[PDB]
Amino acid sequence: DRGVSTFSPEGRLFQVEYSLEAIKLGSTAIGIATKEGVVLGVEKRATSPLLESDSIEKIVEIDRHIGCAMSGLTADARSMIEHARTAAVTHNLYYDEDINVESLTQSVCDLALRFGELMSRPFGVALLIAGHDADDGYQLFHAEPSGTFYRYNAKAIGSGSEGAQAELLNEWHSSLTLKEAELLVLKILKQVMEEKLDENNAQLSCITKQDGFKIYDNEKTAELIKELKEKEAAE
Amino acid sequence: MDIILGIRVQDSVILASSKAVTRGISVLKDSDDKTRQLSPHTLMSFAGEAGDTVQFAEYIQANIQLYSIREDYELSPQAVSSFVRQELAKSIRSRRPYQVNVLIGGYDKKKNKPELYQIDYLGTKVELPYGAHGYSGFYTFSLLDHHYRPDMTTEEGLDLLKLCVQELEKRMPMDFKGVIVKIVDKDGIRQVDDF
């Protein structure tokens, strides 16, 4: 055995690089950013059909203008969400305004690397943080346990991510409507999901400037799934 | 706060507590319950410094409820009283002591005995046939010394209490807006709905 804060000969932190492996084993999460809003979708992956799928909370509200989807050891995400919510409400208490999406992400990532011999290990979960602010409009951020965060027009994390990202790379253009982006997330999820996509084993959400972060109930998502098959069958 | 009384009769403990809550020259409320059920067969009435009274009662209530759940068993009134005394005895040498006086009325199911405990904010405990905190005692102790009999029924106990409230409404300078009365017996705790 050997220290938790040790560098590899290649110049990477062992414990960080190993956490990245744990995230690859996670259920899929996809986000897409447009001028009409940001869409967040996830694979629920119920381990058994006795488990009540609606109790699988992998898309989570941080504030009215900031939502968050997770992939990996999802229990590790609880304290990250708790910190993010406190940081957003606290900012609003100190400054009578909405926290910037980047500033909230930077706050979450400042937790990431405070482990060692502070918490005992890095987080084994990646986050897609999606939101809107007046300064830089609609934004999607990938927040890793390295303490790094990237902004993306679209991003996939979890098991199906290499396949999903190559799919997003072609499909994304700068004038996607919110509708198109919803269908695109549904389409790419059904491709990389082991079992067959329905309103019970996959969940959609968006954040708009007008109506903030909303999780879609299974009725609305079931209609987008029915809509998706009609576009596909008709080419 | 001000008025809290207790009479232990043959088969019950009766707690009478004033309904008035006053700040300055305003009666803010005239229907205040100065009582918490600690366990199904144990009731605590309280009087003293604003805020401290409720905070103390509810803290004690939480601790007795926790003990009940943990041991699936109800603490004897003697045990609850000793716990409460020790908490007050601790508080009095604290940074800011709890300024709360309490009566504990309980029915011990093992002995089949009603028990009344009077405890002041210093943690001074006594077991009493009848008790009072504050100015009330200056009228009620001598009155009960004369009229109280050890073998009285619950109905006689309530009549003895009417005497006490009548006397306090006659001679006390402040309007305490009547009392809420509660009986603790072998069947638990009930409140008399008009007095």
Partner: protein, 222 residues
């Protein structure tokens, strides 16, 4: 026994126009019956088109302004060079003041600037962080002399429309920067005549969307 507080006198005054705002202060600094300085500025450009004065105990005033200027500098760093709106500044200063609730900053604080709609804004604070937005406010030694004059001449209080039999009020309307400066110069010359801690110099900071301009005027030195 050691008294941690003192009174450095002086008086401050803020007024909000439609598309401008002023924060005026006398440049006199006193303790007891002595003049420390005839020109010690106590109205400061704090960046992001916010001007601030903390009048009263000078030491506590300088401490607060320093901490706010520092607060603005870190807001830029921590929030990608974003402009600190006057409302957000106001709320920040509440927290600065309320931090020392049990050993307060002995100052009356006024900030002036433009709100996020480009309108003139004035916020004023008690020593322990209470605050409210208002069209105008005076602070410090001569507050009690100047404030009722501002109520009358800025908000047209107790003024009625001639020959309406006291039923139609004089109509509230925004003042020109030229008119606001007349009221400020007259507020201070009146304050100087009647208050011993007010005099020497008047310094005015005017805030428009084009930035912070400064005007200065001699006052009676007695």
């Amino acid at each position: 026994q050691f008294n941690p507080y003192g009174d450095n006198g002086g008086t401050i005054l803020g007024i909000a126009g439609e598309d401008f705002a002023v924060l005026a202060g006398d440049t006199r600094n006193i303790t007891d019956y002595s003049i420390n300085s005839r020109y010690e500025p106590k109205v400061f450009d704090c960046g992001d088109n916010i001007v601030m004065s903390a009048n009263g105990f000078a030491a506590d005033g300088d401490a607060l302004v320093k901490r706010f200027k520092n607060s603005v500098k870190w807001y830029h760093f921590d929030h990608n060079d974003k402009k600190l709106s006057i409302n957000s500044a106001a709320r920040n200063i509440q927290h600065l003041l309320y931090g020392k609730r049990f050993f307060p900053y002995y100052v009356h604080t006024i900030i002036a600037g433009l709100d996020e709609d480009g309108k003139g804004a004035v916020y004023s604070f008690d020593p322990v962080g209470s605050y409210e937005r208002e069209q105008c406010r005076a602070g410090g030694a001569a507050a009690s002399l100047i404030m009722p004059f501002l109520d009358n001449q800025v908000n047209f209080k107790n003024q009625y429309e001639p020959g309406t039999n006291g039923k139609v009020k004089k109509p509230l309307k925004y003042l020109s920067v030229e008119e606001v400066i007349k009221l400020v110069r007259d507020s201070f010359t009146s304050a100087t005549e009647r208050h011993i801690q007010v005099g020497d110099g008047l310094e005015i900071l005017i805030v428009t969307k084009d930035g912070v301009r400064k005007e200065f005027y001699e006052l009676k030195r007695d």
